Structure formats: structure tokens, C-alpha cells
Amino acid sequence: VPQLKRTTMRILIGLLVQNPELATLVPPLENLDENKLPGLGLFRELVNTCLSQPGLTTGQLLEHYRGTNNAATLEKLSMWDDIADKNIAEQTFTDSLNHMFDSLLELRQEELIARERTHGLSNEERLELWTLNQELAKKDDIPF
User: Regarding domains, what does the record say?
Assistant: First the structure.
């Protein structure tokens, strides 16, 4: 078992590999841009494998990826932060899903600030940035 720093995507991917039934808790991710958030593309792939192979075990899930360039990462995460308590696994998974979407909100806020600095914002973007600012105020070679 490796010692890895926690990140949101490490928690989500580790818990999903260890408990493939958590895939059915994940809302549709098809339209999200994997390029903005390291680990999101792999997480979405794993969800899709689970939903495509109901009944699968952790070992069966990992088998699909063992010849890919993510095999080492997934093997490490399959053994890391193991939570044998399904109550805690589900609650931690749901909490981290919410944190992932919070991070996408912060990434969008940063995108709007970049546009603002380079050529200004439209009325619609100004409303979005205002709501994001209020909402966010209220709130080892693995590459994510």
C-alpha cells in the first residue's frame, strides 16, 4: 500500500475502483471538459466501464485498464485509503463529488477573470462572475 497525498480525484477514483457499485451514484459527466480538471477523464471512463459491466468486481474493473498507461495509478489507488465501511465509502464519495463540482465552479470563475483581464466581460458573463463570487465565498507520480 503506497502512501499518497489526498486529492479529490484520488479519493473518487480510489473509492470507485474499490467499490464499483458507486458508479451508479455519479450523474452524467459526458459534457464536462476533461482538459480542465486532471483525473476527470479517467474517472468518467471508470464510471462508464462499471455501468457497462454490471456485477463486476474490483479485479475485473482493473483488468480492463491493466495494459493502459493508467494501470500503475489504478493499481496504487486500488490499495490506498481503503474504506471497508460502505456507509463511510458512500458518504465520502458523495462529499467528494460535490467538491469536484465546486472545483469546476472555481475553474470557471478563473476563466471569466482571465477573459475580463484580456478583453472585458459581456453582461451575461458579469452576472455569472458575480454569482460565482458569491457562491464561492459562501463555500508519487499520479497526475491528479
Answer: Contains an N-terminal zinc-binding domain, a central core domain that contains the primase activity, and a C-terminal DnaB-binding domain.
